[PDB]
Amino acid sequence: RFPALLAELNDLLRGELSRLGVDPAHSLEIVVAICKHLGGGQVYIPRGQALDSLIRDLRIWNDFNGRNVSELTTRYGVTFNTVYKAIRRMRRLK
DNA sequence: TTCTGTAAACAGTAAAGCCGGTTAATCCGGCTTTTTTTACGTCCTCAATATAATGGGAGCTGTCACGGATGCA
Protein backbone atom coordinates (compact mmCIF):
# COMPACT_ATOMS: atom_id res chain seq x y z
CA ARG A 1 0.00 0.00 0.00
CA PHE A 2 2.90 2.33 0.76
CA PRO A 3 4.68 2.54 -2.66
CA ALA A 4 1.88 3.75 -4.94
CA LEU A 5 0.47 6.12 -2.31
CA LEU A 6 3.92 7.60 -1.68
CA ALA A 7 4.48 7.99 -5.43
CA GLU A 8 1.17 9.80 -5.90
CA LEU A 9 1.89 11.99 -2.87
CA ASN A 10 5.27 12.96 -4.33
CA ASP A 11 3.67 13.64 -7.72
CA LEU A 12 1.12 15.98 -6.15
CA LEU A 13 3.78 17.70 -4.02
CA ARG A 14 6.01 18.36 -7.03
CA GLY A 15 3.03 19.53 -9.08
CA GLU A 16 2.05 21.98 -6.34
CA LEU A 17 5.66 23.20 -6.08
CA SER A 18 5.77 23.77 -9.85
CA ARG A 19 2.46 25.63 -9.65
CA LEU A 20 3.79 27.79 -6.79
CA GLY A 21 7.13 28.39 -8.55
CA VAL A 22 9.27 26.06 -6.43
CA ASP A 23 11.40 23.42 -8.11
CA PRO A 24 9.48 20.10 -8.30
CA ALA A 25 12.48 18.05 -7.13
CA HIS A 26 12.39 19.90 -3.80
CA SER A 27 9.22 17.89 -3.12
CA LEU A 28 11.46 14.88 -2.47
CA GLU A 29 12.98 16.76 0.47
CA ILE A 30 9.47 17.61 1.61
CA VAL A 31 8.28 14.03 1.52
CA VAL A 32 11.52 12.84 3.10
CA ALA A 33 11.01 15.43 5.82
CA ILE A 34 7.44 14.31 6.45
CA CYS A 35 8.51 10.66 6.26
CA LYS A 36 10.77 11.46 9.21
CA HIS A 37 8.25 13.50 11.20
CA LEU A 38 4.97 11.67 10.51
CA GLY A 39 5.86 8.02 11.24
CA GLY A 40 5.08 5.90 14.26
CA GLY A 41 2.34 3.52 13.19
CA GLN A 42 -0.63 2.87 10.94
CA VAL A 43 -3.46 5.39 10.61
CA TYR A 44 -5.62 6.39 7.65
CA ILE A 45 -5.20 9.88 6.20
CA PRO A 46 -8.47 11.86 6.09
CA ARG A 47 -9.17 15.58 6.42
CA GLY A 48 -9.88 18.08 9.17
CA GLN A 49 -13.43 16.89 9.77
CA ALA A 50 -13.60 18.96 12.95
CA LEU A 51 -11.97 21.77 10.98
CA ASP A 52 -14.35 21.00 8.11
CA SER A 53 -17.35 21.63 10.36
CA LEU A 54 -15.53 24.63 11.85
CA ILE A 55 -15.07 26.33 8.47
CA ARG A 56 -18.60 25.26 7.51
CA ASP A 57 -20.00 27.14 10.51
CA LEU A 58 -17.63 30.03 9.75
CA ARG A 59 -19.06 30.33 6.24
CA ILE A 60 -22.60 29.87 7.57
CA TRP A 61 -22.36 32.79 9.99
CA ASN A 62 -20.38 34.90 7.52
CA ASP A 63 -23.27 34.60 5.08
CA PHE A 64 -25.74 34.99 7.96
CA ASN A 65 -26.92 38.52 8.75
CA GLY A 66 -30.59 37.92 9.61
CA ARG A 67 -33.39 36.23 7.68
CA ASN A 68 -30.87 34.73 5.23
CA VAL A 69 -30.74 31.87 7.73
CA SER A 70 -33.54 30.46 5.58
CA GLU A 71 -31.22 30.95 2.61
CA LEU A 72 -28.68 29.03 4.69
CA THR A 73 -31.14 26.13 4.82
CA THR A 74 -31.40 26.73 1.06
CA ARG A 75 -27.61 27.07 0.62
CA TYR A 76 -26.74 23.38 1.04
CA GLY A 77 -29.54 22.02 3.24
CA VAL A 78 -28.80 21.98 6.97
CA THR A 79 -30.63 22.35 10.27
CA PHE A 80 -31.47 25.55 12.11
CA ASN A 81 -30.26 23.90 15.33
CA THR A 82 -26.64 23.73 14.17
CA VAL A 83 -26.96 27.25 12.72
CA TYR A 84 -28.14 28.58 16.09
CA LYS A 85 -25.35 26.69 17.86
CA ALA A 86 -22.86 28.23 15.42
CA ILE A 87 -24.27 31.71 16.07
CA ARG A 88 -23.87 31.17 19.81
CA ARG A 89 -20.34 29.87 19.14
CA MET A 90 -19.39 32.99 17.18
CA ARG A 91 -20.83 35.00 20.07
CA ARG A 92 -18.61 33.04 22.48
CA LEU A 93 -15.41 33.75 20.56
CA LYS A 94 -14.08 37.30 20.62
C1' DT B 1 27.00 -28.25 3.29
C1' DT B 2 20.75 -28.30 4.60
C1' DC B 3 16.71 -27.38 8.20
C1' DT B 4 14.83 -23.78 12.02
C1' DG B 5 13.44 -18.65 14.04
C1' DT B 6 12.25 -12.91 13.97
C1' DA B 7 11.81 -8.02 13.16
C1' DA B 8 9.74 -4.85 9.33
C1' DA B 9 5.41 -4.63 7.90
C1' DC B 10 0.51 -4.74 6.38
C1' DA B 11 -4.67 -6.93 7.45
C1' DG B 12 -8.02 -7.07 11.30
C1' DT B 13 -11.50 -6.09 15.75
C1' DA B 14 -13.44 -2.33 19.31
C1' DA B 15 -14.87 2.25 20.81
C1' DA B 16 -16.16 7.16 20.75
C1' DG B 17 -16.08 12.77 19.00
C1' DC B 18 -18.46 14.36 16.21
C1' DC B 19 -21.78 15.00 13.61
C1' DG B 20 -25.44 15.98 9.21
C1' DG B 21 -29.09 15.48 9.59
C1' DT B 22 -33.41 13.81 13.41
C1' DT B 23 -37.47 15.00 16.37
C1' DA B 24 -39.65 17.12 20.08
C1' DA B 25 -40.69 21.45 22.89
C1' DT B 26 -42.03 26.91 23.79
C1' DC B 27 -43.27 31.69 22.38
C1' DC B 28 -45.72 36.27 19.20
C1' DG B 29 -49.70 37.66 16.19
C1' DG B 30 -54.48 36.51 14.18
C1' DC B 31 -58.65 34.50 12.48
C1' DT B 32 -62.59 32.13 13.72
C1' DT B 33 -66.02 30.37 15.96
C1' DT B 34 -68.55 30.28 20.76
C1' DT B 35 -71.05 32.26 23.84
C1' DT B 36 -73.26 36.07 25.69
C1' DT B 37 -76.63 40.78 25.99
C1' DT B 38 -79.42 44.08 24.25
C1' DA B 39 -82.83 46.05 20.71
C1' DC B 40 -86.62 45.32 18.99
C1' DG B 41 -89.86 43.62 16.21
C1' DT B 42 -92.92 39.98 16.17
C1' DC B 43 -95.68 36.65 18.48
C1' DC B 44 -98.52 35.23 22.17
C1' DT B 45 -102.20 36.17 25.82
C1' DC B 46 -106.09 38.17 27.62
C1' DA B 47 -110.28 41.35 28.23
C1' DA B 48 -114.62 43.30 26.60
C1' DT B 49 -118.65 44.17 23.74
C1' DA B 50 -124.77 46.74 27.10
C1' DT B 51 -131.60 46.38 21.62
C1' DA B 52 -132.48 41.55 21.79
C1' DA B 53 -131.52 37.11 21.57
C1' DT B 54 -134.62 31.18 26.22
C1' DG B 55 -134.87 23.31 24.14
C1' DG B 56 -130.88 19.44 18.50
C1' DG B 57 -132.37 15.89 17.67
C1' DA B 58 -129.35 15.82 11.40
C1' DG B 59 -129.22 12.12 9.61
C1' DC B 60 -130.53 8.85 10.97
C1' DT B 61 -130.67 3.65 10.14
C1' DG B 62 -132.61 0.60 5.12
C1' DT B 63 -133.24 -3.53 7.19
C1' DC B 64 -128.94 -11.34 7.53
C1' DA B 65 -129.74 -14.47 10.25
C1' DC B 66 -128.27 -17.69 13.70
C1' DG B 67 -128.11 -19.15 18.38
C1' DG B 68 -127.48 -17.98 23.34
C1' DA B 69 -128.58 -15.96 27.03
C1' DT B 70 -131.38 -12.67 29.81
C1' DG B 71 -134.34 -10.14 32.51
C1' DC B 72 -138.47 -9.49 33.40
C1' DA B 73 -144.39 -9.23 34.16
Distance A14 CA to B55 C1' (A): 144
Minimum CA–C1' distance nucleotide for A1: B10
A75 CB-near residues (< 8 Å, 6+ apart): A60, A63
A1-46: in CATH 1.25.40.420? no
Pairwise CA distance, residues A38 & A30, whole Å: 12
Class of domain A47-94: mainly alpha
Domains A1-46 and A47-94 share a fold: yes
Q: What is the 3-state secondary structure (H, E, C) of chain A?
A: CHHHHHHHHHHHHHHHHHHHCCCCCHHHHHHHHHHHHCCCCCCCCCCCHHHHHHHHHHHHHHHCCCCCHHHHHHHCCCCHHHHHHHHHHHHHCC
Distance A50 CA to B6 C1' (A): 41
Domain ranges across chain A? 1-46, 47-94
Report whether A14 contacts A20 (CB < 8 A): no
